[PDB]
Amino acid sequence: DKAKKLENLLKLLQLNNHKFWRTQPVKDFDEKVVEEGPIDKPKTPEDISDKPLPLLSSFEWCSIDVDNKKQLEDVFVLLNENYVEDRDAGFRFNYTKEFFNWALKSPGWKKDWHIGVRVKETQKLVAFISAIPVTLGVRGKQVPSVEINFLCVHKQLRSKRLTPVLIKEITRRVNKCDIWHALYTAGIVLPAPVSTCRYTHRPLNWKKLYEVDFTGLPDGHTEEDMIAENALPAKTKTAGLRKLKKEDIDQVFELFKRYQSRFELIQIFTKEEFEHNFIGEESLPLDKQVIFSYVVEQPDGKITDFFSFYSLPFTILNNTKYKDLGIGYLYYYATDADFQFKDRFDPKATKALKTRLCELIYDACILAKNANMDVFNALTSQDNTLFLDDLKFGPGDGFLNFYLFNYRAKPITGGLNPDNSNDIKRRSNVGVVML
Ligand SMILES: CCCCCCCCCCCCCC(=O)SCCNC(=O)CCNC(=O)[C@@H](O)C(C)(C)COP(=O)(O)OP(=O)(O)OC[C@H]1O[C@@H](n2cnc3c(N)ncnc32)[C@H](O)[C@@H]1OP(=O)(O)O
């Protein structure tokens, strides 16, 4: 009743170009957090069933092996054909097998949790729902959990109220393994964001981006002025910048730990799931390479800085010139630039971190460009708000809502000022980066 009013103002907020959750362990819109913790009363793996939920006649569940060749393919057919909301938008997600070999083969992954739904006779995958187990860090407290991603239902049967059962099953499949919480992120407004960030875009090939109608021409600007505006150099600028390597880890894992700890919602990385996350499947041609990791090694051997980014390209339709779009997304980064200071928000410690973040992420743009990326993405999350405006990361209209399943939390800052502008003042406290 009051929660509906708040939902509207929040939806009104994000506006641009509940029979299920009404019975789920989530924060409601009105609810002011008294104490951070579990919603649902403490349950046990035996209090939770072992029956995969029955679904409408003609369907069945299916576990999907990422090691299996044709199983993985089914997914990145259905996702590619259906993930794009509009069928006429003239672009599609192109999830490649190399991509899911990274994102679905998580250390601690179990093919049982890469749930799917098939049609009985035809063996046609019509829905997929993934979950990969991680340990979170909600304001100082260590919450062992799981990340739910890649929810998707076949165009031809939406409004079929199947997503509930898809969430309800993964709920059960996780629940029986001694895990009862989750991080999950959506673009649409659901009952109880802990935070919201905003998508932003950095041209790398503006000439192209225009010719595909992903960016336009502002009032009183030549097609030329814009080319000259976003133009980048060929070589990365900052001293001793190198690709991440097996040996770097223990120095980087410390650097990333010390840095990441400032945020209120981080993933606790175990040195092994960190290594799986930042070193990609070895030997892959430049157009297949999923993850891109980089690190600064001082002359002595000290690793000062670290950044990484992942490629998820679109396929482009109805365009003679171009067949697809190279899309890099900024990921997890680190730097010691503000370590000597006591306070993160000390104006001198902020200017010290900033001018570093400008350099490192400027060099990221060069590198992404060099890997044949057209547009480099980054949210208003983390300390990102420091460089975005300076590095021509013009605003995008996308809003990412971060939600926690079965855990109360007071609003974590997202890097947005109430008027949707970038919050240069307080930055952001969101530490995790979802896909
Ligand atoms: C402890 C661990 C337990 C694990 C559980 C973790 C819980 C977290 C799980 C959350 C998943 C993480 C999300 C990601 O991974 S994000 C992935 C979202 N993906 C996309 O938007 C692109 C592809 N989209 C599709 O295929 C669409 O058809 C979707 C699937 C989005 C809607 O499909 P459809 O149009 O056919 O809907 P329905 O009739 O079957 O079902 C209607 C109900 O579903 C609610 N709905 C609609 N969209 C979403 C959405 N994106 N998240 C959560 N809920 C959503 C909706 O409010 C309604 O419920 P209620 O509002 O009436 O109650």
Side-chain angles (χ1 to χ4, degrees), residues 1-57 59-435:
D1 199 0
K2 310 282 184 184
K4 297 161 202 153
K5 185 174 165 76
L6 274 45
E7 187 186 2
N8 293 321
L9 272 54
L10 184 63
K11 267 158 68 166
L12 265 181
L13 196 98
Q14 310 196 156
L15 141 83
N16 60 349
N17 300 321
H18 285 280
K19 304 170 172 186
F20 178 66
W21 301 95
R22 276 167 202 169
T23 55
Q24 286 290 316
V26 277
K27 186 214 278 191
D28 201 14
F29 290 106
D30 47 10
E31 186 175 354
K32 194 59 228 157
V33 177
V34 172
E35 178 197 12
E36 294 198 346
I39 318 274
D40 237 50
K41 58 165 195 172
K43 284 195 165 188
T44 46
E46 294 314 305
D47 271 317
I48 256 70
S49 195
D50 197 27
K51 63 188 175 185
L53 245 157
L55 50 183
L56 328 155
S57 71
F59 299 105
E60 84 216 17
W61 306 100
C62 71
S63 293
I64 295 151
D65 191 25
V66 190
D67 301 78
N68 197 85
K69 188 76 178 183
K70 290 157 187 177
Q71 276 174 56
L72 197 63
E73 198 194 316
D74 300 340
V75 160
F76 72 81
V77 173
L78 196 71
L79 275 286
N80 294 355
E81 285 183 11
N82 302 263
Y83 222 56
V84 202
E85 298 278 333
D86 182 18
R87 203 155 148 179
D88 274 41
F91 77 93
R92 314 232 170 288
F93 281 85
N94 185 216
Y95 288 113
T96 47
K97 52 186 183 64
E98 296 77 4
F99 183 86
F100 287 130
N101 206 60
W102 172 69
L104 295 180
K105 258 199 165 90
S106 175
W109 79 280
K110 175 85 265 186
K111 52 190 187 171
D112 303 50
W113 284 10
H114 300 318
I115 282 98
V117 168
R118 295 191 201 277
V119 183
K120 268 179 181 172
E121 288 170 59
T122 73
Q123 293 305 298
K124 197 179 203 281
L125 189 60
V126 283
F128 174 79
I129 203 281
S130 174
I132 61 159
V134 299
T135 39
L136 292 174
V138 198
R139 258 180 271 257
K141 199 211 268 178
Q142 209 138 313
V143 186
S145 44
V146 66
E147 284 172 359
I148 276 80
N149 220 311
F150 307 114
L151 218 207
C152 149
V153 166
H154 183 95
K155 282 167 177 161
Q156 213 69 81
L157 68 190
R158 288 166 197 197
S159 299
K160 243 76 181 181
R161 267 282 185 185
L162 192 78
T163 282
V165 189
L166 280 174
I167 297 168
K168 269 193 170 186
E169 181 55 23
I170 213 346
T171 299
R172 190 198 63 72
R173 291 220 189 182
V174 163
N175 267 198
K176 221 226 161 199
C177 293
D178 231 8
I179 305 295
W180 290 275
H181 316 297
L183 183 80
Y184 64 108
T185 55
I188 93 279
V189 166
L190 289 154
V194 195
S195 189
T196 309
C197 294
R198 180 175 175 145
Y199 278 108
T200 72
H201 320 291
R202 215 294 184 186
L204 301 170
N205 192 331
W206 194 91
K207 179 64 189 69
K208 178 163 176 158
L209 273 149
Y210 192 68
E211 289 283 353
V212 183
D213 319 296
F214 269 60
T215 179
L217 177 139
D219 298 5
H221 275 268
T222 324
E223 192 168 316
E224 181 186 4
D225 301 334
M226 311 290 296
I227 323 280
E229 174 74 14
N230 299 269
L232 258 38
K235 319 164 207 175
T236 36
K237 257 67 191 155
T238 50
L241 213 185
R242 170 173 48 69
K243 314 183 170 184
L244 183 81
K245 275 188 170 179
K246 271 202 167 192
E247 297 74 59
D248 297 303
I249 281 148
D250 281 332
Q251 199 158 177
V252 183
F253 185 76
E254 287 307 298
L255 181 68
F256 178 60
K257 271 299 159 209
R258 219 221 257 199
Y259 175 89
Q260 207 204 24
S261 58
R262 68 184 68 209
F263 302 114
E264 293 180 332
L265 184 66
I266 78 282
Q267 190 188 309
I268 272 88
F269 289 87
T270 70
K271 41 79 213 161
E272 143 209 12
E273 65 195 9
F274 167 107
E275 171 164 359
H276 162 69
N277 231 61
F278 304 150
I279 285 111
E281 173 108 333
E282 212 232 301
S283 65
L284 293 170
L286 192 52
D287 47 288
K288 304 258 201 174
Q289 189 172 357
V290 186
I291 224 281
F292 283 84
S293 289
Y294 294 99
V295 146
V296 162
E297 187 194 27
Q298 296 289 314
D300 59 312
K302 185 160 192 168
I303 277 91
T304 308
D305 316 285
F306 148 74
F307 59 83
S308 60
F309 59 80
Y310 76 95
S311 153
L312 212 189
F314 280 150
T315 228
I316 295 162
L317 322 161
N318 311 286
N319 199 293
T320 337
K321 293 214 284 176
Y322 314 105
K323 306 307 156 196
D324 50 74
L325 191 73
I327 304 169
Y329 294 78
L330 188 55
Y331 208 47
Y332 287 97
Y333 62 91
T335 171
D336 71 11
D338 71 335
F339 280 14
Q340 325 140 319
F341 302 88
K342 287 174 163 186
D343 200 286
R344 180 189 170 180
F345 295 96
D346 167 38
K348 297 182 191 185
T350 314
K351 193 173 281 182
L353 209 223
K354 184 193 188 173
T355 184
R356 200 45 174 182
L357 296 184
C358 279
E359 282 153 44
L360 293 172
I361 307 302
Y362 190 69
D363 284 14
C365 283
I366 286 108
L367 289 159
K369 185 174 189 163
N370 288 7
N372 316 313
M373 314 260 72
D374 297 318
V375 60
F376 191 72
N377 290 158
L379 292 91
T380 63
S381 67
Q382 310 149 78
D383 293 312
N384 290 319
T385 289
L386 286 184
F387 57 83
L388 297 160
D389 303 297
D390 279 327
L391 302 185
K392 332 260 187 171
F393 281 89
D397 62 296
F399 291 99
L400 220 198
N401 301 121
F402 304 78
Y403 308 93
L404 297 162
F405 188 81
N406 181 224
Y407 194 92
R408 270 169 213 100
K410 286 193 273 68
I412 304 169
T413 69
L416 296 176
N417 275 140
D419 70 303
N420 278 343
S421 66
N422 311 281
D423 186 34
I424 51 161
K425 331 191 174 210
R426 303 190 301 262
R427 289 174 267 171
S428 177
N429 251 334
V430 171
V432 281
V433 188
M434 290 279 283
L435 307 159

